[PDB]
Amino acid sequence: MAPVPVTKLVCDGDTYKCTAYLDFGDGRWVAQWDTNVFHT
Amino acid sequence: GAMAPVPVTKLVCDGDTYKCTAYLDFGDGRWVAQWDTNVFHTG
Amino acid sequence: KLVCDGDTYKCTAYLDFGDGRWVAQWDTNVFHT
Numbered sequence: 001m002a003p004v005p006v007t008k009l010v011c012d013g014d015t016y017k018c019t020a021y022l023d024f025g026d027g028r029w030v031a032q033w034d035t036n037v038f039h040t
Numbered sequence: 041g042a043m044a045p046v047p048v049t050k051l052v053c054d055g056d057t058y059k060c061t062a063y064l065d066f067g068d069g070r071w072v073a074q075w076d077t078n079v080f081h082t083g
Numbered sequence: 084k085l086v087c088d089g090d091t092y093k094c095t096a097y098l099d100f101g102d103g104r105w106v107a108q109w110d111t112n113v114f115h116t
C-alpha cells in the first residue's frame with residue numbers, strides 16, 4: 001500500500017471531477033475521480 | 041472558457057447511502073460533488 | 084483524515100463514527116502533473 005495525506009481537495013463543476021493534491025515526493029501527484037455535481 | 045476548480049469546505053461520507061459528499065466553495069453553499077463509495081471496517 | 088494511494092488507486096476517508104474503525108474508500112485515478 002502507499003497511502004499519503006491529501007493536502008488540498010478541489011472539485012470542478014465543468015469537468016465533474018474532484019482533484020486531491022497529494023503530500024508526496026516532488027509535490028506533482030494528484031488523485032482525481034468522477035463525481036456528480038448538484039445543488040442540494 | 042474553463043472554470044477553475046473550487047475548494048471543498050466539508051467532506052461527509054454517509055455509511056447509510058454509500059455516498060461521499062463534498063460541499064463546494066461556490067454560490068450559496070448548497071452545491072455539492074457526490075460520488076459512490078465502499079464503506080467497511082478496518083482490520 | 085483523507086488519504087490516497089498510488090499503489091492501490093484508492094482514496095480513503097477515516098470516519099469518526101462508532102469505534103473509529105470505519106472507512107469510506109473509492110476508486111481513483113492517480114497521476115503526475
Ligand SMILES: [Zn+2]
Binds near residue numbers: 013014042043045
Ligand atoms: Zn473546470
Ligand SMILES: [Zn+2]
Binds near residue numbers: 070
Ligand atoms: Zn441555492
Ligand SMILES: [Zn+2]
Binds near residue numbers: 084099
Ligand atoms: Zn474527525
Ligand SMILES: [Zn+2]
Binds near residue numbers: 081102104
Ligand atoms: Zn469495530
